[PDB]
Short mmCIF file of C-alpha atoms and ligand atoms in Angstrom, two decimals:
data_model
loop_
_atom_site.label_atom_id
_atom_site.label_comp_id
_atom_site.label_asym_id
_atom_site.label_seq_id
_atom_site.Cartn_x
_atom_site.Cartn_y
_atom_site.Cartn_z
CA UNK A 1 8.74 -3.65 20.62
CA UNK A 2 6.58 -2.11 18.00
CA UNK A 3 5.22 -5.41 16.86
CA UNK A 4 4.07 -6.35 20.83
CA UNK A 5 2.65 -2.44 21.62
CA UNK A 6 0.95 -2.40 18.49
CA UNK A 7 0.03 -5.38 16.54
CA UNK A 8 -2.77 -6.99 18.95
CA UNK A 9 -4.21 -3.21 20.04
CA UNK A 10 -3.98 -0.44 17.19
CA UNK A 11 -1.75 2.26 18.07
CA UNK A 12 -2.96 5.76 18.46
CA UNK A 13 -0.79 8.46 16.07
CA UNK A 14 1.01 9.48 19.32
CA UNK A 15 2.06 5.83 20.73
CA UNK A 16 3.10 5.59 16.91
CA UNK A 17 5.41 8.70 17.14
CA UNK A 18 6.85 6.82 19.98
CA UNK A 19 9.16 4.70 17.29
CA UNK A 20 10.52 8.30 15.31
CA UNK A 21 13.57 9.27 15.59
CA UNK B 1 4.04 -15.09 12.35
CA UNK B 2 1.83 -14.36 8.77
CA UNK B 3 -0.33 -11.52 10.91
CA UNK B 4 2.52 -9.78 12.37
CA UNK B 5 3.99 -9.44 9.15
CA UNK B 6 1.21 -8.10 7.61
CA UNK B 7 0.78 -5.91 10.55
CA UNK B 8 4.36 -4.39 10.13
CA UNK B 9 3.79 -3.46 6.62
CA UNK B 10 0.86 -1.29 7.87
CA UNK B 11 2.70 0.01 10.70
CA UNK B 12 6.10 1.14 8.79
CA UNK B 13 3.86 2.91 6.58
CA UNK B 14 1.82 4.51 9.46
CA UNK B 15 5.87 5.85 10.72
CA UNK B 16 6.50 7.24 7.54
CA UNK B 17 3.62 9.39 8.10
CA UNK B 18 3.18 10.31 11.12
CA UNK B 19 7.63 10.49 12.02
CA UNK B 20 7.44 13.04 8.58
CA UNK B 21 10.94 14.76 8.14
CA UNK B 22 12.58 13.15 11.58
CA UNK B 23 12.26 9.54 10.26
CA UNK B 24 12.28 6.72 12.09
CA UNK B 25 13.85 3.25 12.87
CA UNK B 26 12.18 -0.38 12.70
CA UNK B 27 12.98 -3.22 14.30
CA UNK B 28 10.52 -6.27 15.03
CA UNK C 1 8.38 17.47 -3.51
CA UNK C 2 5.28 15.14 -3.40
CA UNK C 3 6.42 13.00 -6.15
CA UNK C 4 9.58 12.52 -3.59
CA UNK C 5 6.74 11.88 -0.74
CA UNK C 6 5.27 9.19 -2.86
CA UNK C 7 8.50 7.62 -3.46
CA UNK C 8 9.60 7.53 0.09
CA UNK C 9 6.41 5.44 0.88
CA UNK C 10 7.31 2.96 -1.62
CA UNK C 11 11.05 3.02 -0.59
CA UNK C 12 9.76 1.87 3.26
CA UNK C 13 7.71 -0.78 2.18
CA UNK C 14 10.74 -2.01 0.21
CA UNK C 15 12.80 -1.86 2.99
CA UNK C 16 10.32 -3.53 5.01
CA UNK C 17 10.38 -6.36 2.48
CA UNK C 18 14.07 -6.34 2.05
CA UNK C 19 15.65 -6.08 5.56
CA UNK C 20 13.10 -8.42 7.18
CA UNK C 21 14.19 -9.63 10.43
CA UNK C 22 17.00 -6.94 11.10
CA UNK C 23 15.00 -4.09 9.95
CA UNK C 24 15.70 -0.80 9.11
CA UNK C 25 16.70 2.85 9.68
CA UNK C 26 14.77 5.42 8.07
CA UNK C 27 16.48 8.51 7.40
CA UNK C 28 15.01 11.66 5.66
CA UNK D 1 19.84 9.86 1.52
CA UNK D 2 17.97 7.17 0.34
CA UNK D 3 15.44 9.62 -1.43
CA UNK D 4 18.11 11.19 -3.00
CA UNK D 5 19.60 7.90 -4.41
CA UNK D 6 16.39 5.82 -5.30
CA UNK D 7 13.85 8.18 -6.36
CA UNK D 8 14.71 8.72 -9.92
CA UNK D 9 16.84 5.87 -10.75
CA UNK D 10 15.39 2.10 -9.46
CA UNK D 11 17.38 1.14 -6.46
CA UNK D 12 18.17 -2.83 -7.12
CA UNK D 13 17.33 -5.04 -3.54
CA UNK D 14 21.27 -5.13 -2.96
CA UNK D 15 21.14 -1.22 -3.16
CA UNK D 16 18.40 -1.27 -0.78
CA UNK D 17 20.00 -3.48 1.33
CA UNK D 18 22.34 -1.11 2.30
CA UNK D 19 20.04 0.88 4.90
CA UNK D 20 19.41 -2.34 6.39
CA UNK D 21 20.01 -2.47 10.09
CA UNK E 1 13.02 4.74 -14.26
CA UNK E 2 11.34 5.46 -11.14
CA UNK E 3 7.94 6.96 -11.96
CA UNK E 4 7.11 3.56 -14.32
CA UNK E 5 8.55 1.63 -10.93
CA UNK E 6 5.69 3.24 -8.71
CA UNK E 7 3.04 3.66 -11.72
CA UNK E 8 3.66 -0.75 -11.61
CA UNK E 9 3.37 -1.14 -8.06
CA UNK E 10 -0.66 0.53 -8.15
CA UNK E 11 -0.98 -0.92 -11.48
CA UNK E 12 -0.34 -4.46 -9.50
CA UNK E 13 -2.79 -3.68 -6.86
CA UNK E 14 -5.59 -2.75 -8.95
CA UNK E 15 -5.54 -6.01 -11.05
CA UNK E 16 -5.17 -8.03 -8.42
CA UNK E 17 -8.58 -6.34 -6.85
CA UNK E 18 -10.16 -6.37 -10.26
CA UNK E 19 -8.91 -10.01 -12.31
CA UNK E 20 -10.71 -11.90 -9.00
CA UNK E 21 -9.83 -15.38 -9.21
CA UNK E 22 -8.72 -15.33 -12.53
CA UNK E 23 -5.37 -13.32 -11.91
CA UNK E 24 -3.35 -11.73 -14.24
CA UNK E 25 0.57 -11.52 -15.32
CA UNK E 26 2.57 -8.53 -15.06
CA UNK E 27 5.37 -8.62 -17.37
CA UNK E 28 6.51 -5.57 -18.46
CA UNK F 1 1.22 -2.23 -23.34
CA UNK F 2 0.25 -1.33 -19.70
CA UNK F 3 2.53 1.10 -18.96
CA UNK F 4 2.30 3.15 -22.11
CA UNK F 5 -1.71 2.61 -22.04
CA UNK F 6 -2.19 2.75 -18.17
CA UNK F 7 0.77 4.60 -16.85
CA UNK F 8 0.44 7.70 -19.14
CA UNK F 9 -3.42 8.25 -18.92
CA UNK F 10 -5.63 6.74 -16.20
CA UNK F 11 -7.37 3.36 -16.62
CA UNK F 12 -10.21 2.56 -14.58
CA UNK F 13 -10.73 -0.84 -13.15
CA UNK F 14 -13.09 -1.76 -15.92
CA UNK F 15 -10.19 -0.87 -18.55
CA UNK F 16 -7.04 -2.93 -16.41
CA UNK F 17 -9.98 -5.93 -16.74
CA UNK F 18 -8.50 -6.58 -20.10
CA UNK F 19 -4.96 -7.26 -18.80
CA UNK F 20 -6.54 -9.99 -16.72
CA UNK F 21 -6.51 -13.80 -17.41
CA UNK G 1 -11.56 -15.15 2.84
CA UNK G 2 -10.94 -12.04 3.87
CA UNK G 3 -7.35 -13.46 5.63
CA UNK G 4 -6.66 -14.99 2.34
CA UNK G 5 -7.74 -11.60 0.40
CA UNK G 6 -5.43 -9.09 2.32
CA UNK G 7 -2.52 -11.65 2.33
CA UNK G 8 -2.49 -11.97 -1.22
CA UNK G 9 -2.29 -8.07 -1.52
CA UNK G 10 0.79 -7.94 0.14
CA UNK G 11 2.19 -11.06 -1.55
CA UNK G 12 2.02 -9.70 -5.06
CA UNK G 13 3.26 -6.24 -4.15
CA UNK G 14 6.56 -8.80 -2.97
CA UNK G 15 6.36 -10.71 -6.29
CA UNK G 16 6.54 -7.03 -7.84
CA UNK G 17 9.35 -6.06 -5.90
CA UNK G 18 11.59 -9.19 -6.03
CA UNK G 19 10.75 -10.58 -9.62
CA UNK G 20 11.73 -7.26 -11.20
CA UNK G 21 11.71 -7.87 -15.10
CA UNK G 22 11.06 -10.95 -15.45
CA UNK G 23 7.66 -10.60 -13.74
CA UNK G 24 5.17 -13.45 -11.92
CA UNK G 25 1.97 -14.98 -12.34
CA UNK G 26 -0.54 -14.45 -9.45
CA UNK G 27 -3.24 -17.43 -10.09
CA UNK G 28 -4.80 -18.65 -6.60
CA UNK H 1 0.96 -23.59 -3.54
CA UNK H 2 1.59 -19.66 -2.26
CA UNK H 3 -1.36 -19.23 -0.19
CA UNK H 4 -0.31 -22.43 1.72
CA UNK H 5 2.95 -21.81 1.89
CA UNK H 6 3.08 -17.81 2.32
CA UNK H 7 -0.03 -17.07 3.83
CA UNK H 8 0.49 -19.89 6.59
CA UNK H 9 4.09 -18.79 7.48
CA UNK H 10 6.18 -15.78 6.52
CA UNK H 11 7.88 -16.28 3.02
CA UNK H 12 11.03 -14.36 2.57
CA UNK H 13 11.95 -12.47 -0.58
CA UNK H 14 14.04 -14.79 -1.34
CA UNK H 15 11.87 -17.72 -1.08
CA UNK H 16 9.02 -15.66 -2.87
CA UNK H 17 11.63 -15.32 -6.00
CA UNK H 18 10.55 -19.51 -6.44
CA UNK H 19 6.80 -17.94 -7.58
CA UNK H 20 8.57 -15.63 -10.36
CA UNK H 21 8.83 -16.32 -14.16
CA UNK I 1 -3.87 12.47 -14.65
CA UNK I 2 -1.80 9.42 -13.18
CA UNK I 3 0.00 11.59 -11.03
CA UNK I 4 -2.58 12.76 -9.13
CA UNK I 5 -4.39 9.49 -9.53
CA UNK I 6 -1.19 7.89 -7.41
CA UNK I 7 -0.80 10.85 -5.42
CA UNK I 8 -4.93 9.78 -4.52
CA UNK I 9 -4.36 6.77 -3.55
CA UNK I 10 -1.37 7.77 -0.99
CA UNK I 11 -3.87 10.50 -0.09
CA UNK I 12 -6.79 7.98 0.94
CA UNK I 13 -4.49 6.31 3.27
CA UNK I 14 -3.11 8.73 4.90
CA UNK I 15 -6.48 9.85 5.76
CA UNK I 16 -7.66 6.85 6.97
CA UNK I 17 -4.87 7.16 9.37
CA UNK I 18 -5.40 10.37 10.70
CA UNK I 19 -9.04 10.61 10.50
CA UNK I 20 -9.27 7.64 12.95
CA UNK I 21 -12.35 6.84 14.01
CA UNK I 22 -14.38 9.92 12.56
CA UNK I 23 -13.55 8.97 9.11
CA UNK I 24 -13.33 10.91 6.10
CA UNK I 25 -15.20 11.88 2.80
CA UNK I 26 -12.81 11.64 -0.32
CA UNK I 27 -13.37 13.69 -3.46
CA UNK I 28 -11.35 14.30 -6.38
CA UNK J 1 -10.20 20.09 -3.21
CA UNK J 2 -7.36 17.42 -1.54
CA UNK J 3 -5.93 16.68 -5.15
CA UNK J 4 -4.93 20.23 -5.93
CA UNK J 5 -4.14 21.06 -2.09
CA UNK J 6 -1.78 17.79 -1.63
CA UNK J 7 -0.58 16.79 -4.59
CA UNK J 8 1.56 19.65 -5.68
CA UNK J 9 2.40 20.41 -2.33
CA UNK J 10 2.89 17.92 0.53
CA UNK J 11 0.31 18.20 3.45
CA UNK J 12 1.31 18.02 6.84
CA UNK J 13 -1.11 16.38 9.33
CA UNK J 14 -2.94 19.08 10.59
CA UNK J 15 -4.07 20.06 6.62
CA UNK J 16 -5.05 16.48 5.96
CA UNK J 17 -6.77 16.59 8.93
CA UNK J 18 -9.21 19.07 7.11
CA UNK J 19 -10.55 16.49 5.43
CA UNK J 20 -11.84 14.31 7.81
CA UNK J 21 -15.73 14.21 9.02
CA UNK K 1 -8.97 -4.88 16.67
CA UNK K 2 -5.75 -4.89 14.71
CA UNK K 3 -7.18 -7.19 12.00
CA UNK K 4 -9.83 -4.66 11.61
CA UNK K 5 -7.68 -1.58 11.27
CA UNK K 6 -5.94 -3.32 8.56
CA UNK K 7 -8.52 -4.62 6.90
CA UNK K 8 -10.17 -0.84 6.54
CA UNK K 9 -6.72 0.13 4.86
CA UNK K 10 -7.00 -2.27 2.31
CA UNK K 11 -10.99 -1.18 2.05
CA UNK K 12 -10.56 2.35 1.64
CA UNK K 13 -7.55 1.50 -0.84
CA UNK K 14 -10.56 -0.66 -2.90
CA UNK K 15 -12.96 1.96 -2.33
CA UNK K 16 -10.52 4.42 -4.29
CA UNK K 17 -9.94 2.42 -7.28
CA UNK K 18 -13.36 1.23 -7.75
CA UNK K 19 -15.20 4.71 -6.42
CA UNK K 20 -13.09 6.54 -9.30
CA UNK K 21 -14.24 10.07 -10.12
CA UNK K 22 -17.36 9.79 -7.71
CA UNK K 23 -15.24 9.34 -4.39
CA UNK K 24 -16.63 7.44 -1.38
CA UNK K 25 -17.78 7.89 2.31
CA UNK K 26 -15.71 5.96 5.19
CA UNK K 27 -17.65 6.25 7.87
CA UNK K 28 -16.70 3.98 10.87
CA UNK L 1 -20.72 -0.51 8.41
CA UNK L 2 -18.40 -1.60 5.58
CA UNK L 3 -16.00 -2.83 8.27
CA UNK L 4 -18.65 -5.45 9.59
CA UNK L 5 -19.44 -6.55 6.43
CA UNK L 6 -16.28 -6.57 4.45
CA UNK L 7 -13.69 -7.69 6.77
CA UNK L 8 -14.27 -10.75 7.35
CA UNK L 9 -16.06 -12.42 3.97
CA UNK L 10 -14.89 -10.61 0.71
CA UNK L 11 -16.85 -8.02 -0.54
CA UNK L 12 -16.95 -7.56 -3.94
CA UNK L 13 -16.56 -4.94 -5.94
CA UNK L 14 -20.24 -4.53 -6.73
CA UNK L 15 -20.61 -4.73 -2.56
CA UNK L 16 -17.58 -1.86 -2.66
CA UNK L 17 -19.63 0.22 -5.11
CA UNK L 18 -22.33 0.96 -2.60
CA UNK L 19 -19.81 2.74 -0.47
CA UNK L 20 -19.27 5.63 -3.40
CA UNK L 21 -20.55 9.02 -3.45
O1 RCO M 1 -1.66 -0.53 15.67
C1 RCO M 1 -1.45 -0.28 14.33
C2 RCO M 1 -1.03 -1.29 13.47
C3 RCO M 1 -0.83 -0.97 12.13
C4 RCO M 1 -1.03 0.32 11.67
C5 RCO M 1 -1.44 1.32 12.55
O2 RCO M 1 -1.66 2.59 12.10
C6 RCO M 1 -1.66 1.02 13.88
O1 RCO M 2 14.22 3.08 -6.28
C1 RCO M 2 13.08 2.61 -5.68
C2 RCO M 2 12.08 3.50 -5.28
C3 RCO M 2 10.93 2.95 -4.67
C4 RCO M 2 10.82 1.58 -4.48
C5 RCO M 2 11.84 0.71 -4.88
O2 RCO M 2 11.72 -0.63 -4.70
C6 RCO M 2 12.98 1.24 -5.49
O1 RCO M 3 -3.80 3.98 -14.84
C1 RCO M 3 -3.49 3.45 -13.62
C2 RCO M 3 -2.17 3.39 -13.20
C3 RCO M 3 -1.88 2.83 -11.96
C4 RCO M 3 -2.90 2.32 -11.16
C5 RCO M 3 -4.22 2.39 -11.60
O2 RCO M 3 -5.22 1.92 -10.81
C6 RCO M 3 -4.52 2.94 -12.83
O1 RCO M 4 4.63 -14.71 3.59
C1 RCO M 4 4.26 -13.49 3.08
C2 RCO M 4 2.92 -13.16 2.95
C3 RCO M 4 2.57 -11.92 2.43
C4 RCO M 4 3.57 -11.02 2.03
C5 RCO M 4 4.90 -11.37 2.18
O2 RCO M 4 5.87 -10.49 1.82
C6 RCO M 4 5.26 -12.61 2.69
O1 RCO M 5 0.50 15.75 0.31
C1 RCO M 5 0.37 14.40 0.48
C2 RCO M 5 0.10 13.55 -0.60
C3 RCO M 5 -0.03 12.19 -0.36
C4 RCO M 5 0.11 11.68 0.92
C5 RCO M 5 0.38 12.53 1.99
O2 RCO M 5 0.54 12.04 3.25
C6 RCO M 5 0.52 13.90 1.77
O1 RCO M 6 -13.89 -7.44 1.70
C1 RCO M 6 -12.77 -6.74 1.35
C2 RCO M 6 -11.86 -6.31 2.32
C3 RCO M 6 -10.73 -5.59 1.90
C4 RCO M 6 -10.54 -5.32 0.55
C5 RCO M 6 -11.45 -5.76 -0.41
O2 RCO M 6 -11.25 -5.51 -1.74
C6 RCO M 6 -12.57 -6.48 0.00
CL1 CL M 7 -3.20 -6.78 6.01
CL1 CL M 8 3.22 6.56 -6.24
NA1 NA M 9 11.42 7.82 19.47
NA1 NA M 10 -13.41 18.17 7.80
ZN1 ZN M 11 -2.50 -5.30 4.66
ZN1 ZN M 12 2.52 5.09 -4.88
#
């Protein structure tokens, strides 16, 4: 989930959009 | 897990910014 | 429709706080 | 929505609660 | 009201970056 | 108080010093 | 600390949230 | 006290209502 | 103004997010 | 400047973007 | 890397509040 | 940059004030 994907590497603004509805 | 708490806090705002008017959905 | 903006960060870290575990659906 | 309800008037944590998952 | 809400929340942050080891009470 | 001093004209971080302990 | 520093941020923006009127002490 | 308690192991709201006045 | 000066602080963040790694210059 | 661009009006990404270096 | 993303949020935030009127430079 | 030398001991806010404009 988001925690795993983005919590140990930072998350670029388009793996973030990943989570919008 | 303290960090990955922390970290969520950061990353639900980061959502509300970058999902804008479509919004978005959180689960840990 | 900033000071709505401003809220809705506030109102996602509240929900962050407040659902916890089961999360939450944000809907705008 | 949630904007709508909880951006004039404070929204209590049971209120909030309510867009819970 | 809502505006005093969010006004508090900032209000928090700054004196807990500012009062140091010290702290602070918020009452209001 | 703080609100009426601090929430209706901007205090800087010297000026919130004097809510502190 | 810098761990203890940006934990304690987030920890009094929860004691702001949950302790509504009533209000908290942040000491550490 | 809260830094050993919270800092060391997430603290619910509910938990974190024990540190209020 | 306290609006704006919350409306700042919302401001700085977002930037920080979307500036990334070239950062950002802030000025009221 | 960003105050009187974003605070009266919401900016989307692209006009915050402006203001990064 | 995470730790230092979030740490920059909570600098930038500090840089804000103390920078005031003057604003401040995050360069990374 | 700040990042190396705030993130892991505390800066304080004379340390933060070098980072202004
Ligand atoms: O990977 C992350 C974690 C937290 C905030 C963010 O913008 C990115
Ligand atoms: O009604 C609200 C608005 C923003 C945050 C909050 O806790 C309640
Ligand atoms: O006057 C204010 C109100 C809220 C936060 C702050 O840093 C200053
Ligand atoms: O255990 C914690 C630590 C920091 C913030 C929080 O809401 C809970
Ligand atoms: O127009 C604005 C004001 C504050 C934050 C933001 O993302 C946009
Ligand atoms: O060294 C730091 C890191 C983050 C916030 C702050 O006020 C100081
Ligand atoms: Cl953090
Ligand atoms: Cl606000
Ligand atoms: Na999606
Ligand atoms: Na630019
Ligand atoms: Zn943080
Ligand atoms: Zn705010």
């Amino acid at each position: 989930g988001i925690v795993e994907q983005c919590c140990t590497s930072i998350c670029s603004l388009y793996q973030l959009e990943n989570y919008c509805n | 897990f303290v960090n990955q708490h922390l970290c969520g806090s950061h990353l639900v705002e980061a959502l509300y910014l970058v999902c804008g008017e479509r919004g978005f959905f959180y689960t840990p």
